[PDB]
Coordinates of C-alpha atoms and ligand atoms in Angstrom, one line a residue:
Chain A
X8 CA -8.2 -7.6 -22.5
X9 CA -4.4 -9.0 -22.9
X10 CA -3.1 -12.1 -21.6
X11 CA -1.6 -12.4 -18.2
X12 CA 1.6 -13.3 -20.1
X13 CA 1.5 -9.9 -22.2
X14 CA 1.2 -8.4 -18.5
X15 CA 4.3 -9.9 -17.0
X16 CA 6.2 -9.0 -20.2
X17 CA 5.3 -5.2 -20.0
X18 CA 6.2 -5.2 -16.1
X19 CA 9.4 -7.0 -17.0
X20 CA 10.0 -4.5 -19.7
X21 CA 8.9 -1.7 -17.4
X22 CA 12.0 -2.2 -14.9
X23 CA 13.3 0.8 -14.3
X24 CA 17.7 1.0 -14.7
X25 CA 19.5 0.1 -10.8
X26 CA 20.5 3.7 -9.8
X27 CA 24.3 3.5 -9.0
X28 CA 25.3 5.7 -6.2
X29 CA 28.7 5.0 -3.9
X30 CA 29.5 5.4 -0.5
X31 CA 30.6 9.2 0.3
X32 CA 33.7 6.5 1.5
X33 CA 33.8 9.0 4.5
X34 CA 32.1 7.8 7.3
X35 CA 29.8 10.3 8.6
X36 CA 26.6 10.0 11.6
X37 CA 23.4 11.4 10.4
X38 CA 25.0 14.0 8.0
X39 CA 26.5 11.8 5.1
X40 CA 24.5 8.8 5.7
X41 CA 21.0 10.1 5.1
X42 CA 22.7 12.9 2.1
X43 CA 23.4 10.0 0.1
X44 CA 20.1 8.3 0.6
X45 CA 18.4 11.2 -0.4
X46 CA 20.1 11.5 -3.6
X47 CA 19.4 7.6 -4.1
X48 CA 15.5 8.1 -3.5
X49 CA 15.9 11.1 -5.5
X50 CA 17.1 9.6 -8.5
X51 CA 15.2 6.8 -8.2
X52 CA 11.5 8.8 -8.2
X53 CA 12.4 10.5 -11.5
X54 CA 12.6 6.5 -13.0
X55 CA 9.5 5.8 -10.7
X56 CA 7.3 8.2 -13.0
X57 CA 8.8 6.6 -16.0
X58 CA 8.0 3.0 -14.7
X59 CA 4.7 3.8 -13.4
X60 CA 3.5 5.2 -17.0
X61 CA 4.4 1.8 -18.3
X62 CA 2.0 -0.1 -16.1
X63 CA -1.4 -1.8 -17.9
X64 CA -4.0 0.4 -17.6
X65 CA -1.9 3.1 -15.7
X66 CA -2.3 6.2 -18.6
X67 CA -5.7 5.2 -19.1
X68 CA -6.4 6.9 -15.3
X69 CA -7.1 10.3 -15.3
X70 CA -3.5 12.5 -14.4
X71 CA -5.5 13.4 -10.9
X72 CA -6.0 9.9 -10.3
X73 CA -2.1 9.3 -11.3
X74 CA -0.9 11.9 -9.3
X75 CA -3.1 10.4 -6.4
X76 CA -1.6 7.3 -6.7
X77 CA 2.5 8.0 -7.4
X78 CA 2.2 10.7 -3.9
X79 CA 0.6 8.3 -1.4
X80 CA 2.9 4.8 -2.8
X81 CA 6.2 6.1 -3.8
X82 CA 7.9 5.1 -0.3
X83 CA 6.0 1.9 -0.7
X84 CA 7.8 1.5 -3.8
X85 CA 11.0 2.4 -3.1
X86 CA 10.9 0.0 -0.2
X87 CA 9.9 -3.1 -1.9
X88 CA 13.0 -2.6 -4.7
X89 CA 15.1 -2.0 -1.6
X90 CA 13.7 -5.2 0.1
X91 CA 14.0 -6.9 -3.5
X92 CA 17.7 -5.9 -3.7
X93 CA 18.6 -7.0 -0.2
X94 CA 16.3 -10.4 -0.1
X95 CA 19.5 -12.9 -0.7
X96 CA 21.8 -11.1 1.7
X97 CA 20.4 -11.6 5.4
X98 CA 21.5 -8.7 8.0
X99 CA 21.8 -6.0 5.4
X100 CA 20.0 -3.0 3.1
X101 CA 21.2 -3.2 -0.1
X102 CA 20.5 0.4 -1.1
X103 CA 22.4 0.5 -4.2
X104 CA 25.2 -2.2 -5.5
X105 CA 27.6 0.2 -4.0
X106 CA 26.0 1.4 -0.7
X107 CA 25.4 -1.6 1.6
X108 CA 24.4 -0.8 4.9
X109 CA 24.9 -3.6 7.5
X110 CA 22.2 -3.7 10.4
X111 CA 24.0 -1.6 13.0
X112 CA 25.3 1.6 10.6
X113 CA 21.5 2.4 10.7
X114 CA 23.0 3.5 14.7
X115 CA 24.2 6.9 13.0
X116 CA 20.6 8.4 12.4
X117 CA 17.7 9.6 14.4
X118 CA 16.0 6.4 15.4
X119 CA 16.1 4.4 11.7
X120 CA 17.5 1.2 13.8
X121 CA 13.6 0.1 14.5
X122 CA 12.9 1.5 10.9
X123 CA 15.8 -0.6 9.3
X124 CA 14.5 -3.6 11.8
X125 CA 11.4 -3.7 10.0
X126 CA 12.4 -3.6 6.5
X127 CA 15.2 -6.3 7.3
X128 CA 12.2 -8.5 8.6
X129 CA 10.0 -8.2 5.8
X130 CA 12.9 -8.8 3.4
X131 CA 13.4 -12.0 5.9
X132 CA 9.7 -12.7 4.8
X133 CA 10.3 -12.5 1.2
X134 CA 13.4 -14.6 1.2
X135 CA 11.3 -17.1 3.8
X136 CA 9.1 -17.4 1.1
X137 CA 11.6 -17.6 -1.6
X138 CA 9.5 -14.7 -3.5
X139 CA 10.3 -15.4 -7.2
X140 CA 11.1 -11.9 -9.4
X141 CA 8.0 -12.6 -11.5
X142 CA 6.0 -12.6 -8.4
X143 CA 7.7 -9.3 -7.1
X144 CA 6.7 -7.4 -10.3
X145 CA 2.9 -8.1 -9.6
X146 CA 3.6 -7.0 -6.1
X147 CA 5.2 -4.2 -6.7
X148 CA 2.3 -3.2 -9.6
X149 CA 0.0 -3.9 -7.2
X150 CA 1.3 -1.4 -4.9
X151 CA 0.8 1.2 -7.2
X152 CA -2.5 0.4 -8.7
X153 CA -3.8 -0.3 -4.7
X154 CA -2.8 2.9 -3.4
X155 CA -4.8 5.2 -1.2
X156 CA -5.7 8.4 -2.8
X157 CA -5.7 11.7 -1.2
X158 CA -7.8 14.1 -0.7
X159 CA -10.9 12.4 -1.8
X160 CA -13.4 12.8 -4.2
X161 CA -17.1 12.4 -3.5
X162 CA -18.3 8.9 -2.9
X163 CA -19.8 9.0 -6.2
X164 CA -16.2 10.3 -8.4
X165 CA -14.6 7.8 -5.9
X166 CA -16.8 4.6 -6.9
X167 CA -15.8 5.2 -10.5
X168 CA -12.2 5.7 -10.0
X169 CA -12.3 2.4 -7.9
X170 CA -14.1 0.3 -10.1
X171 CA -11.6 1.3 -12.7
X172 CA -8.6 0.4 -10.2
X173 CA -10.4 -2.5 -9.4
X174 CA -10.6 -3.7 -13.2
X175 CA -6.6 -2.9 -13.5
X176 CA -6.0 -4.7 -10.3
X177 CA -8.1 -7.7 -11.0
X178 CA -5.3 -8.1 -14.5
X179 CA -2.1 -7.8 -12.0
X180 CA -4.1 -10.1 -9.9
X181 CA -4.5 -12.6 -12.3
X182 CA -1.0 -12.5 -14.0
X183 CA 0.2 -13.4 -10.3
X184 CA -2.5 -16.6 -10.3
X185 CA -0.6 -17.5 -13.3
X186 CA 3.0 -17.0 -12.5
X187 CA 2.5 -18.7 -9.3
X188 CA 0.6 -21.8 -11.0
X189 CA 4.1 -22.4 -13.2
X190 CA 5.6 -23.5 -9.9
X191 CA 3.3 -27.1 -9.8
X192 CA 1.9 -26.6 -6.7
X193 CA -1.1 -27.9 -5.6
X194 CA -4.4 -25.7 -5.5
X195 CA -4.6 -25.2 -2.0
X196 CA -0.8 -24.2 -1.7
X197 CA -1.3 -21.7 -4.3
X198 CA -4.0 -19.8 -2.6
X199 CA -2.0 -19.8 0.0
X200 CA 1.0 -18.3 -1.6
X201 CA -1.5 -15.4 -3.4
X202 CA -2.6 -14.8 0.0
X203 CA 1.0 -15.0 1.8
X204 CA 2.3 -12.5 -0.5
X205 CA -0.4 -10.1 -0.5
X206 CA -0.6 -10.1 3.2
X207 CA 3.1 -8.7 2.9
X208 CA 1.4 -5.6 1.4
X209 CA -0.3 -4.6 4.7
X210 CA 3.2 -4.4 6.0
X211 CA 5.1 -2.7 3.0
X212 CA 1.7 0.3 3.8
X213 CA 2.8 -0.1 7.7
X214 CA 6.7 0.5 7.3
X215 CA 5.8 2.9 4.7
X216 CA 3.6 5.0 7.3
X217 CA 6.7 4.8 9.9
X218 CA 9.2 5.5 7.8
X219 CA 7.1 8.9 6.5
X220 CA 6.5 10.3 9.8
X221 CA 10.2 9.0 10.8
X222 CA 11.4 11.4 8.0
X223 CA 8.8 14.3 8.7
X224 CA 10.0 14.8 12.2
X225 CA 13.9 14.9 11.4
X226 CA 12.9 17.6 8.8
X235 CA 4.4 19.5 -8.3
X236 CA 6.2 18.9 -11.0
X237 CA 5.2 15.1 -11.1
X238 CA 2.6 16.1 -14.5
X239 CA 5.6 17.6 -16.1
X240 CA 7.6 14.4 -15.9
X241 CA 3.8 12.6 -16.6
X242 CA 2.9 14.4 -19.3
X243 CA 6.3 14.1 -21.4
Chain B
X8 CA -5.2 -29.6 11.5
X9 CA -8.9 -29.3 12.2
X10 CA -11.5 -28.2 9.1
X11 CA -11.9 -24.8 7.9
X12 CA -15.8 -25.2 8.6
X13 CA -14.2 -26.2 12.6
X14 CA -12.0 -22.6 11.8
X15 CA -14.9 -20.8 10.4
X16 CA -17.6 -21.9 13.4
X17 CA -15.1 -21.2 16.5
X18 CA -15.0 -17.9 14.6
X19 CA -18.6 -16.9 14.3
X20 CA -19.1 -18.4 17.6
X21 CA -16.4 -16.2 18.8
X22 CA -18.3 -13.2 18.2
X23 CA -18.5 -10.4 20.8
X24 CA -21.6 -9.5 22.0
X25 CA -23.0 -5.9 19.8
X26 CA -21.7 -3.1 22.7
X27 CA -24.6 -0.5 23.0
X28 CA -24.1 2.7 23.4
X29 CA -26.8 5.7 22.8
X30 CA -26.3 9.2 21.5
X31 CA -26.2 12.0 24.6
X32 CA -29.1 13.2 22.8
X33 CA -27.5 16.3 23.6
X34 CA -25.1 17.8 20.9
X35 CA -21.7 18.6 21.5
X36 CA -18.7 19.7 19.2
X37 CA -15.4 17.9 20.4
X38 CA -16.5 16.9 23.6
X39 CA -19.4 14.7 23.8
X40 CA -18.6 13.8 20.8
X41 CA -15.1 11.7 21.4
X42 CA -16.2 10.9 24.8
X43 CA -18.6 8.5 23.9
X44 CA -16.4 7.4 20.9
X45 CA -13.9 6.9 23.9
X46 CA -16.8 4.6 26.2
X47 CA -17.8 2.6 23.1
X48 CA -14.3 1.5 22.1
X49 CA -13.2 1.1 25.4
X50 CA -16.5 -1.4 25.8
X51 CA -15.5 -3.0 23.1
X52 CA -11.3 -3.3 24.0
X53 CA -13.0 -5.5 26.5
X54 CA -14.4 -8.2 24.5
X55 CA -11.9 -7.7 22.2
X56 CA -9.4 -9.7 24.4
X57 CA -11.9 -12.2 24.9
X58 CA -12.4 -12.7 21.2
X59 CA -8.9 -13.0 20.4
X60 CA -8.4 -15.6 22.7
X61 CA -10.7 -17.7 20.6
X62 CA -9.0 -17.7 17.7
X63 CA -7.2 -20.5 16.9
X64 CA -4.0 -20.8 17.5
X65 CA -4.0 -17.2 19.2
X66 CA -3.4 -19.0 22.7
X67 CA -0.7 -21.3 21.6
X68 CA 1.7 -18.5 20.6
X69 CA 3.7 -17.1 23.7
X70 CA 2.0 -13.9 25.8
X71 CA 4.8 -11.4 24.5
X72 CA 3.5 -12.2 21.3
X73 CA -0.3 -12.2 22.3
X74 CA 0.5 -8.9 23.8
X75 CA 2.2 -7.7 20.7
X76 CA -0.3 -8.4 18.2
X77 CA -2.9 -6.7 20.1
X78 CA -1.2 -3.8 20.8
X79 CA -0.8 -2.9 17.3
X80 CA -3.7 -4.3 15.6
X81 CA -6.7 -3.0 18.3
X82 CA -7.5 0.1 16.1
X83 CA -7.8 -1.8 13.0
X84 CA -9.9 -4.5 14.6
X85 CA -12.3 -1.9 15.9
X86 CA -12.2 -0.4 12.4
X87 CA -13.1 -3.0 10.3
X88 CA -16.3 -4.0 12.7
X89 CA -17.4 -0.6 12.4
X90 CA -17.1 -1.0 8.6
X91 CA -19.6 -4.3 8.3
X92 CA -22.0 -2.1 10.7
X93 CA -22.2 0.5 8.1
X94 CA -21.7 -1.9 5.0
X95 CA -25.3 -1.5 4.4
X96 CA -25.9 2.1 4.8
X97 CA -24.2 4.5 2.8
X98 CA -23.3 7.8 4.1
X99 CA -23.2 6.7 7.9
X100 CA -21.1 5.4 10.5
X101 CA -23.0 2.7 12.4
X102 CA -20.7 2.7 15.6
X103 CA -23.6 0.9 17.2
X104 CA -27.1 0.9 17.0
X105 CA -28.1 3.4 18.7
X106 CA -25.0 5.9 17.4
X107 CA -25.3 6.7 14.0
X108 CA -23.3 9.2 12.5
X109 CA -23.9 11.2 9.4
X110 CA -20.7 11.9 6.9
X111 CA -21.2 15.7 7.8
X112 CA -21.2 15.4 11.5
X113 CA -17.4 14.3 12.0
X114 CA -17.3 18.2 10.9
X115 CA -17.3 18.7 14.7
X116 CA -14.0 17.4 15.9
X117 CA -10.6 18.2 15.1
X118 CA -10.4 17.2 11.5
X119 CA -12.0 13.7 11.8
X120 CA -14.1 14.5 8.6
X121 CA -11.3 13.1 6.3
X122 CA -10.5 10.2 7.9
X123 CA -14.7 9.7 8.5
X124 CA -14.0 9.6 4.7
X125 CA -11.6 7.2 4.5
X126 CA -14.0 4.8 6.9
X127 CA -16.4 5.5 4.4
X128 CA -15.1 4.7 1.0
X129 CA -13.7 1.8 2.7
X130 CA -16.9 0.3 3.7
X131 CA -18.6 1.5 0.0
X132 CA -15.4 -0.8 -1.2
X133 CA -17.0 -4.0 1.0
X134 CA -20.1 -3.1 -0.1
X135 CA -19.2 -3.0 -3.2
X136 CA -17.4 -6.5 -3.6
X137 CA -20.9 -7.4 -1.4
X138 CA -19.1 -8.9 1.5
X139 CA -20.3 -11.7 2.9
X140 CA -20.3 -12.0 6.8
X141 CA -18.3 -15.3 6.6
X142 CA -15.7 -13.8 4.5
X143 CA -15.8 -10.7 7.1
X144 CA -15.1 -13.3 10.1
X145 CA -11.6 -14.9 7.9
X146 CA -10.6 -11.0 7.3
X147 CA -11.3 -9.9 10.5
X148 CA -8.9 -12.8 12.4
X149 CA -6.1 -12.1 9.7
X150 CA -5.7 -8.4 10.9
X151 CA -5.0 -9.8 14.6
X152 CA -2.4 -12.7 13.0
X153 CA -0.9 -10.4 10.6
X154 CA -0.6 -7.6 13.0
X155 CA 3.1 -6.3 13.2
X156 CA 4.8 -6.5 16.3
X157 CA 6.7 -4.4 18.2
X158 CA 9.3 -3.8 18.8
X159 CA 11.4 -6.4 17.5
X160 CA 13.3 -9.5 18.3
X161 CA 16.5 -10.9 17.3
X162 CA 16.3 -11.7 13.5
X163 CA 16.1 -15.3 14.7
X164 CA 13.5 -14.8 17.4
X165 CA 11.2 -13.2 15.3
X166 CA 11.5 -15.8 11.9
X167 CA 10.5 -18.7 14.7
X168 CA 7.3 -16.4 15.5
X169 CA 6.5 -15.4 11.7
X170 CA 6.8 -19.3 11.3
X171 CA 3.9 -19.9 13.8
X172 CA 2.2 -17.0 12.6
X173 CA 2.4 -17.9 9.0
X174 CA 1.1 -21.8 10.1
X175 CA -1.8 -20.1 11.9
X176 CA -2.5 -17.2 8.6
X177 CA -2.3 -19.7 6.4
X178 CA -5.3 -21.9 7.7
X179 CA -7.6 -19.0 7.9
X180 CA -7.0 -18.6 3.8
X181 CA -7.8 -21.8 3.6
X182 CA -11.2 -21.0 5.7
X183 CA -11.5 -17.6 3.3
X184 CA -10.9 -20.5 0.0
X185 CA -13.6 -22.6 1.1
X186 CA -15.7 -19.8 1.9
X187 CA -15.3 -18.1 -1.3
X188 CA -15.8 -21.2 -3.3
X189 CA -18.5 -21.8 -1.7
X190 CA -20.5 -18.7 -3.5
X191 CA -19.5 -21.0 -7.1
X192 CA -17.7 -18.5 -9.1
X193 CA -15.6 -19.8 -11.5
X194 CA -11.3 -20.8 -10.3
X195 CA -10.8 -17.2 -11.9
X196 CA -13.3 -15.2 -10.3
X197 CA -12.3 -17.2 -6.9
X198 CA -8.4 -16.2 -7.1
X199 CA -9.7 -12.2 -8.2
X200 CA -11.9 -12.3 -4.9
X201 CA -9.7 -13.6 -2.5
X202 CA -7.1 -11.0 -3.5
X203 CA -10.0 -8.4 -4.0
X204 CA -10.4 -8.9 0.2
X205 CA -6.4 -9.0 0.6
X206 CA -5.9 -6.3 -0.7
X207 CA -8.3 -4.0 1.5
X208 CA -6.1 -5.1 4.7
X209 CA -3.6 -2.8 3.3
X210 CA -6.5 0.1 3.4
X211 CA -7.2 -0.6 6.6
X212 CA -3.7 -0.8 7.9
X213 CA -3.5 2.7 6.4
X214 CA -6.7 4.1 7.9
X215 CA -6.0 3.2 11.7
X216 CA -2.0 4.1 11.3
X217 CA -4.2 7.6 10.5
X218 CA -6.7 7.7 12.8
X219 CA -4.0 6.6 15.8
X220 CA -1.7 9.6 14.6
X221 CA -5.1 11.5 14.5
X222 CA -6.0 10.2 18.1
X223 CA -2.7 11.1 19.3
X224 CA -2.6 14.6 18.2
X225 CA -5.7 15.7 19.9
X226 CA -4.3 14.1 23.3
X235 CA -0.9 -2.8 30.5
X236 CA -3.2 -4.3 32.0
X237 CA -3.4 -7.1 28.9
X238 CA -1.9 -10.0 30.5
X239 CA -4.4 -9.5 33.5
X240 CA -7.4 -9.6 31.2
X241 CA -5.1 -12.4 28.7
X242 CA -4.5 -14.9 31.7
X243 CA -7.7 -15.0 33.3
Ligands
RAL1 O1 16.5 6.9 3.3 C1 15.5 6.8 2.5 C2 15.0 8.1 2.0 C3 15.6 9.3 2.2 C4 15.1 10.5 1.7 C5 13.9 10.4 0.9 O2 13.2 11.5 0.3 C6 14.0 12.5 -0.2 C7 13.0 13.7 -0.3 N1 12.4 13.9 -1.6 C8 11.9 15.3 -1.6 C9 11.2 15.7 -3.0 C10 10.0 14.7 -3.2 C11 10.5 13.3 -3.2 C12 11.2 13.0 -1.8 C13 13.3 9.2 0.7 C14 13.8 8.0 1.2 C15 15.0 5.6 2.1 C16 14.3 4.8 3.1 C17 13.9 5.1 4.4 C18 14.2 4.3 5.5 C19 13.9 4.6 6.8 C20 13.1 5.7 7.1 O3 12.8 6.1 8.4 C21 12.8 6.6 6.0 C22 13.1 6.2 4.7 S1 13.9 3.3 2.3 C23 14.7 3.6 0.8 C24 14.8 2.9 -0.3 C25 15.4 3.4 -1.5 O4 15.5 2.6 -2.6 C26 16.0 4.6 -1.5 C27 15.9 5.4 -0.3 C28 15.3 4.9 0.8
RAL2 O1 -13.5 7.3 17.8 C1 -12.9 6.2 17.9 C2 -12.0 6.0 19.0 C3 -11.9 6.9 20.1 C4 -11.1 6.7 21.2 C5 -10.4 5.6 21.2 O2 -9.5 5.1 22.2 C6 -9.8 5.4 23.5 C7 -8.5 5.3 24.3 N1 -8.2 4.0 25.0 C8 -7.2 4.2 26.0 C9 -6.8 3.0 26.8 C10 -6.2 1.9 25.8 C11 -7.3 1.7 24.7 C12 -7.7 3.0 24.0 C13 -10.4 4.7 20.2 C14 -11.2 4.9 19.1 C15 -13.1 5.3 16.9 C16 -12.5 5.5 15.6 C17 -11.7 6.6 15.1 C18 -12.1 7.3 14.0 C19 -11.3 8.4 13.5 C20 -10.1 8.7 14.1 O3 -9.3 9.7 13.7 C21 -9.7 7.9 15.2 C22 -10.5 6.9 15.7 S1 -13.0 4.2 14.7 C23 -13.9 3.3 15.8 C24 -14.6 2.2 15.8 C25 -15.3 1.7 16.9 O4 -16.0 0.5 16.8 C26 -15.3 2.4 18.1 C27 -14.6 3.6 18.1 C28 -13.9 4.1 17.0

């Protein structure tokens, strides 16, 4: 029972290190382009399991429920950093600070350009709604702690597991409130900024889904990197 | 700028009409089955045009984005009324009254069984949060209006229709507000609810991106029925 203040700190705290990778500097279609990416995403998940084991309440789950979680939100996550990243620079994917992929490069893979369409428009969202880096660490929490586990249980292992998820959501939930009270605005215009940005989380699941299958059709160790 | 009591009556009385549809009252595996899963949601397609016409602000937004919204958000619309059918009877799958499913009878088609599960831990979720059939009428009209569209416009094109959208979301939180603090739960408890509600869109967003990838492996006309 911490304040919502103590919560913001931890996440704050909990920011993983921006992954440096560079451009192979050799153009290349959907060879070179999608190599690079996947050591970016790569190196990225190994500080994903470090960041999520920071999160309120995270450790406290049982590992099945954290392995649950981190395999059915990691492309969630990775997304939102990359929309994060790439929020004050319209038209582009800011991968890394040295791989910036302008709209059309996304031309050289399989069918990304729809993929890349939909990640530049929610990042169009975010800046539209001049998301604040406070408010994009509950967010991207919140992704985590709301993820879909899979297989499930029984409806009765379930029920616990989700009333537990629920208690650590209900924290993240209310350390947004507060951040989004420090702006002033009225009552009514903060509800509707809770409920804009959590709205956005529909979509992160949607381009998420996409972007999964996108990868599937072009192509165990997380308790050992848990447990440490 | 009418009321959210205005927003919250043209809802309920834009209700469709409950589609009835009886068992075959003769077993089948795959094949009866589906096919009257297939009737009942093509009954229901029907009035679901004529419900989203109703909502407001749906008919001031251009057809191609009419037509957009419904093309990707049918499934989950459909979903989450099967979900307050069943909110009150754990275990089953009320697709209407008279075709009611047990948990162990999706064993009969193609691997339905899991996403039968995800349908149902959803609906234990409502149930558990005890949701109210006001706040199930705001929820409901935000899946249409937060419904991605594809594909894409220009950058441009598409902010000037997230604009319209977000003007038309944004009263129906402040419907969902007024409902929820109508129940008088403390400021807290209020902010913890509305997000409690949020939050599930991005379950079902998940469970019909499933169950149309489910649909799909096992196998225009809109404006015509928009217009009229
Ligand atoms: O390009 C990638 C990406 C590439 C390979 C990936 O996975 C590598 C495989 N790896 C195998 C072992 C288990 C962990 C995953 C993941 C993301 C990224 C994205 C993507 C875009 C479109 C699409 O259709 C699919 C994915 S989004 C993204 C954000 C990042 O910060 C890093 C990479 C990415
Ligand atoms: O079984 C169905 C269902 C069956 C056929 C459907 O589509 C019929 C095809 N039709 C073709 C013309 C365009 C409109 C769709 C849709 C839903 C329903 C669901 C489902 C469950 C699991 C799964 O993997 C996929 C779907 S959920 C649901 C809720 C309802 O109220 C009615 C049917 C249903």
């Amino acid at each position: 029972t911490l304040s919502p203040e103590q919560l913001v700190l931890t996440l704050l705290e909990a920011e993983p290190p921006n992954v440096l990778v560079s451009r192979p500097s050799m153009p290349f279609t959907e060879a070179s382009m999608m190599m690079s990416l996947t050591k970016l995403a790569d190196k990225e998940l190994v500080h994903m399991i470090g960041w999520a084991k920071k999160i309120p309440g995270f450790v406290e789950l049982s590992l099945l429920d954290q392995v649950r979680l981190l395999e059915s939100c990691w492309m969630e996550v990775l997304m939102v950093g990359l929309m994060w990243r790439s929020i004050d620079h319209p038209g582009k994917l800011i991968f890394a600070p040295d791989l910036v992929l302008d709209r059309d490069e996304g031309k050289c893979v399989e069918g990304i350009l729809e993929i890349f369409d939909m990640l530049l428009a929610t990042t169009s969202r975010f800046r539209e709604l001049k998301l604040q880096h406070k408010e994009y660490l509950c967010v991207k929490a919140m992704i985590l702690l709301n993820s879909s586990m899979y297989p499930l249980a029984s409806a009765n292992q379930e029920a616990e597991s989700s009333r537990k998820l629920t208690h650590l959501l209900n924290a993240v939930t209310d350390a947004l409130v507060w951040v989004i009270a420090k702006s002033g605005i009225s009552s009514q215009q903060q509800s509707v900024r809770l409920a804009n940005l959590l709205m956005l989380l529909s979509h992160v699941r949607h381009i998420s889904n996409k972007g999964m299958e996108h990868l599937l059709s072009m192509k165990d160790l997380l308790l050992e990197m848990l447990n440490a």
